[PDB]
Amino acid sequence: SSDLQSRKNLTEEISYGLREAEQVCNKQQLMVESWRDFLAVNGEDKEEDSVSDLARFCYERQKSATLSELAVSAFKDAYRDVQALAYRYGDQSNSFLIMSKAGSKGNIGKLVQHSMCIGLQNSAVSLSFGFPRELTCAAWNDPNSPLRGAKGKTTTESYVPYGVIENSFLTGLNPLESFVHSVTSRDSSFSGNADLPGTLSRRLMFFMRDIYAAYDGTVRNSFGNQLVQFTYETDGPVE
Amino acid sequence: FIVRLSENEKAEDYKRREKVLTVYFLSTEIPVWLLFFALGVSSDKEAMDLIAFDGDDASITNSLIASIHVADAVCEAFRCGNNALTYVEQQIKSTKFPPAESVDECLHLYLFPGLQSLKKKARFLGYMVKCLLNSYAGKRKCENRDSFRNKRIELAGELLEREIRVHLAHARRKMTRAMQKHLSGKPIEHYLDASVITNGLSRAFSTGAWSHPFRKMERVSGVVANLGRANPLQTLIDLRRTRQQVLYTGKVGDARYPHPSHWGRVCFLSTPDGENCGLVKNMSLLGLVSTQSLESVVEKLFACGMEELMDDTCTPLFGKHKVLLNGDWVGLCADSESFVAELKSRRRQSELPREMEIKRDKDDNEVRIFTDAGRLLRPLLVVENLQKLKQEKPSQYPFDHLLDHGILELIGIEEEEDCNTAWGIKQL
Amino acid sequence: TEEELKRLYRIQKTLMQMLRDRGYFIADSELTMTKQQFIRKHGDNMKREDLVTLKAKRNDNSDQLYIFFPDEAKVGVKTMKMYTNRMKSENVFRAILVVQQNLTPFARTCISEISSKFHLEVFQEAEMLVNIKEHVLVPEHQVLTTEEKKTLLERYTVKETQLPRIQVTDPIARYFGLKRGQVVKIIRPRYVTYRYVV
Amino acid sequence: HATPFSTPGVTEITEQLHRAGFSRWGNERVYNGRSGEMMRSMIFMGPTFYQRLVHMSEDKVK
Amino acid sequence: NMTYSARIKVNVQVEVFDILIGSIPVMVKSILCK
Amino acid sequence: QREQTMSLYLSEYLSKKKHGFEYGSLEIKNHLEKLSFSEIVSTSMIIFSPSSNTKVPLSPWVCHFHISEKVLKRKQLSAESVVSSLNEQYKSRNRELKLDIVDLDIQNTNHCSSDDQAMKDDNVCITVTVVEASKHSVLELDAIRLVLIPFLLDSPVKGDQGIKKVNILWTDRPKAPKRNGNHLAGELYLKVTMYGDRGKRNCWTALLETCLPIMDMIDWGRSHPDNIRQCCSVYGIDAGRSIFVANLESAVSDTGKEILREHLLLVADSLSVTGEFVALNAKGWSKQRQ
Amino acid sequence: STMKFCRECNNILYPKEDKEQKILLYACRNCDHQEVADNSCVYRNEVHHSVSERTQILTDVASDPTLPRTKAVRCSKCQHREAVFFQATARGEEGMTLFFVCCNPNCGHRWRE
DNA sequence: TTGTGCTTATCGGTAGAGT
RNA sequence: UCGAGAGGUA
DNA sequence: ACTCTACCGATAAGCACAACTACCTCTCCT
């Protein structure tokens, strides 16, 4: 930001963009077979009830995996516009913008997390708790929040965590937001899937080692001169 | 004591294979209703009232009816006389390792030792079956191993205790073998071998293989570690760690991820990276581990207003909430809110142990009290008596004075969820 | 029984298409026959008897193959023996057997024991619902003759063993009725490849 | 104080640095030591705390 | 290079009609420590 | 693989009708999707009604299934249709219910003489009564409740037992391209997932038997199983190789790296030298050498 | 699934049918007591499909399928090709009518076939 | 802790073979 | 030196 | 019409390996 007023304008703009993205996700969640009567062009008196239940959408999203995927896709689609604000509020001499445009290191999303907001934070694995849509001190003390085991809406056994962090790294993170970020990023530090590429490479090498090209132009295996390919199927240009 | 709900596989035809309730006590596999009628119950309606499901579910009713029918088929006329007691005695005697005591004595001491009366343990069994049915119906959530509310930690009081016990048992076996060899055919000092326990402890500390908590063989590893002298920070953080044992490392579950129960007890931002990612957890700065209290809080609980549990099973509990102390149904309370408030007030006046968790959950309609060891505690400011601090006369208050005057208190993980906590003074 | 009639019409059309692809001199009227014409010519009740026909190779009239439709499903060894006797009487070396259900183990042993004298093929009715050859994924298949196979072996100076293999149980091999020891020519959408039936 | 959850705002840090007679953004004008010319862009400089790890080059030589 | 432990003494009586059992390692700055 | 995913493409003749592809896909999904009788029914109860020995002995335990008309309207079903479907399912297998049962008759009634509850007035009632051959072996209630009720609920009123779920998806680069016409905007194909309860019968052949009334709607010239292993048995080794190449290209694109076509083609031709896609384990290598 | 206890010994009653009586009766095996049944209902269960307890969250059972999306149609208010199509009945019309819902987050337009 | 074979055991199961 | 168990490096 | 065997298809029940590469220290015994 050039000055304090620009920073305040950017903060308000980011907040409004996040609210709009959340509303877009809530609208996209309705694309299910249970709301076909409401989505049709008719006269329904339950229009206000769809928008009055704001906290129930988060609970429904965390319990359902398809709804979670749809919400994630909608949030990314809406958050592209939010990420686009860096070019409007960024100077040409900014080192982060220069390195992002040049492609040497980083990208636009990393700069957005640095300055404007971290954004969506979701975990692939299923957990017993859920983020209560706000990431504030009051939310952490709510007995009915998804973080406190279950919301009682009959109990729940597993959750797909889904949280949005309004703050950024520069502004700092409250302990609940830091906890959410740690839960999201804990999967990277695991040692899983470190042996699978090696084992797959070893097996594929064992299968493909004996293959070689012959003088006659055919692709033959070492064992018994077995014909794998009569001619190399490459689209040129040197044989 | 295990109560299992599963489809019947004994003396059951193809058509009738619905879920029934069974009791696994001393590997006897006895029907639940036979045990109910053996424990001073003479009516089906009374047994149903003991299991206060308080709901309308077809599966639960079908399971109860199936259990009744299985109990009737297994033992003829079990309700009349004491046929159920004879049947359970025969089942106990049928075990490969039957207890020496009789049925009239085994039930008193091998079944719910906390409850002295024979009818009270029937009510406890009814409560257990009610909890199982509520969990099956989905009203009650199941216990999770990841949460710290259901976990305890032992550092030296218990880890060394089992090694001492097993080495003492081995020494006793060797001593009695030597005595039998010598008697048939000496100072008492010669009979007892002193090198046994010393060598066992030395080997356990050196090799690092500690005795398994539940298995005689298959000694566990990772209990004893070397200290780091590179810098004082390394030896400070090595002394303050918590280990979670898992059979295999690649497949563990949700134990590698942070949990809301970790708030303030163990650090969630710093965990080792690698195979033991999340299994080893560093304790927080304000982290304390509870210890067993010599004093008994049972006598003080009755002074607050708690009443004794009804011995007769016929008398129902209208609105009296259950009071549980270390898993024992000590008594009942008419109103949970005032009872918990008075208990907390007594604790703040140093009239109760400073390491005690008071839990009140309205969903289960019970009051839960814990005073055992292994619980993780942290100090939190109390705003009710925070104005008492502003005396302006003293300065540099010792922590003991603050605890005695009630400005600060130790809050358990289970108790923290009940109370409302402020993050900062400015927000307060 | 209209569903059975249309199922049999589809099976007959697919069989005629397969025979035409195999070169058995199939008349254009049979290939272009419509469902209405089929049900009008067949009659009220076919009884799985009108479908039984005999076809001869276009190049040589001596070669002939007969298609057999058993009256009832779950055929046994008695009907197999009757079919073998009928083939011996009519002097035909190839036949196609279409059965609603799978054959009995005794029938399989009988049909395998006499494979040297005569060659018999078994096709399920479910398989013949859709023509496998007329598919986008399936490329063009051309069966090389003995002279073509010899020239192919001589050109690359490679034995028949050292070639990519195609099992007899493959749907394309059964569609073309290829026996063991015959190579094929495959054109991909160009570079061509050859597969050896083993 | 640099307490993690009680960190001061960026504005306070900039004001404190400005009161010290330096640029509020932590960057100062520098001159190339080889030629003496003045660099076009200011360089951020500050006394950060660094640690020396136990891993050494000569310990890894084989 | 020796164990820092403490001896354990208990009285044992044998009836027909303070002995040493073992040494336990001592943690630094415990209840029993110089 | 138990799932045995399939892929069905719509025919080109539906393009003439306005919104033809959408209507065709919806009709195919409606016809091919399994719908359990338990989902349709709301309240199931067994009522004691005297037999009165009309003409044939029968159990004095009739099964009353109450179904609201709104659900039938949503699912495009009628009481006569579901009764006929239940009768067809009962006569199709009749292998379960190993008791003294001879015939089963199902009756549809709009209003039933039940005074136990009248919460719903627009819900029809279905009466199912078992018939016994002059025996009292069916008089008990436990056997009926434990056997007959689960059997009726598991019976599908729509679709087939094999088909698990059908979802309609839009794609831009299909695995099976069109013959010559290339709209290239995309096509609305249906992905069918079946049940691998038993490997006795091939899933593709079973699907072919079900789609007989709608053979024209499905473009069988491009439809193919999603699996690679049985695609060779269904359409030949070459089709399986092509689908494997397409899947490998998709996986490489998902990985974000760029790999030349010749490498993937060589891998595909090496893994199918013997005409069968062997596994990457030592067993597959040993079989290929054998 | 209807359980009741007789007034004499407070034990579970077992339903039974007598051909001569031609009426529903309940009699427990503890005492020779028979009472007249009421409502003639021996079993009444609300049909539910929640047979997988504590398992529908971890595993996606797909209880509520997602509506299909097509790119052939073009929206009127905005030039967006993606829309959600489904079949539903009108307020008073008879039959199923195809409906469309625009997928543009900024449009929110729905129209019939 | 499993993924993948892998090899018996085991349940009918009906097809011929015979009377 | 030959081994086992731990702790770390990319 | 009415009955015995016999190779053969689908579910249990135990084995049997294998869960990455290159590195470097430290204690324990062996």
Ligand SMILES: [Zn+2]
């Ligand atoms: Zn009814």
Ligand SMILES: [Zn+2]
């Ligand atoms: Zn009675």
Ligand SMILES: [Zn+2]
């Ligand atoms: Zn639009």
